[PDB]
């Protein structure tokens, strides 16, 4: 089946919560599995400890630059970008979970949580999740953002992991 990991996120080193995800391995194994990784750090790196970087107000929150801290980092456990693996599943509306990217083919880790639908997206980010509880949190973490994208608070995945 497909795993369940979750994000516990801060926000000035104070909790608002924890985000779980389903991932859709069952589309998306390469994608899927990925992120699993990163989120239990199995490989030796991965989100823990690493920030928001991106969040705008009706749009969405992003985040997984776990090297350069910055937008222009992060790296997947397969070596440091792999290719679109399909388009399938689409930017349907609020919670998907989708890859962020420098153009065709440059998946590593950083990723987004859509806070609506951002269908303009479809056939250019690969979605390969959803938000399965914990959209109120997702909220909060918007709450902290602006237009411009930067953030009001510092905004830390404090721990991360598996659940099934
Ligand atoms: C900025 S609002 C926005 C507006 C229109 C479309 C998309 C966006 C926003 C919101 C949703 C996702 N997203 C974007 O994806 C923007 N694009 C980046 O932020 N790109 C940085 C980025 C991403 C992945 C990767 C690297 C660098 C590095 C490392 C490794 N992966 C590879 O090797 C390539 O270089």
Request: glycine residues 14%.
């Amino acid at each position: 089946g497909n795993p369940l990991v979750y994000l516990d996120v801060d926000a000035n080193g104070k909790p608002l919560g924890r985000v779980v995800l389903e991932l859709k391995a069952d589309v998306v194994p390469k994608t899927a599995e990925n992120f699993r990784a990163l989120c239990t750090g199995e490989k030796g790196f991965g989100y823990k400890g690493s920030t928001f970087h991106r969040v705008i107000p009706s749009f969405m929150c992003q985040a997984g630059d776990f090297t350069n801290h910055n937008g222009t980092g992060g790296k997947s456990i397969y070596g440091s970008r792999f290719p679109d693996e399909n388009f399938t599943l689409k930017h349907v509306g609020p919670g998907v979970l989708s890859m962020a990217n420098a153009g065709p083919n440059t998946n590593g880790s950083q990723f987004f949580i859509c806070t609506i639908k951002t269908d303009w997206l479809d056939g250019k980010h690969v979605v390969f999740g959803h938000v399965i509880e914990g959209m109120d949190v997702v909220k909060k973490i918007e709450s902290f953002g602006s237009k411009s994208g930067r953030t009001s608070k510092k905004i830390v995945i404090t721990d991360c992991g598996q659940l099934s």
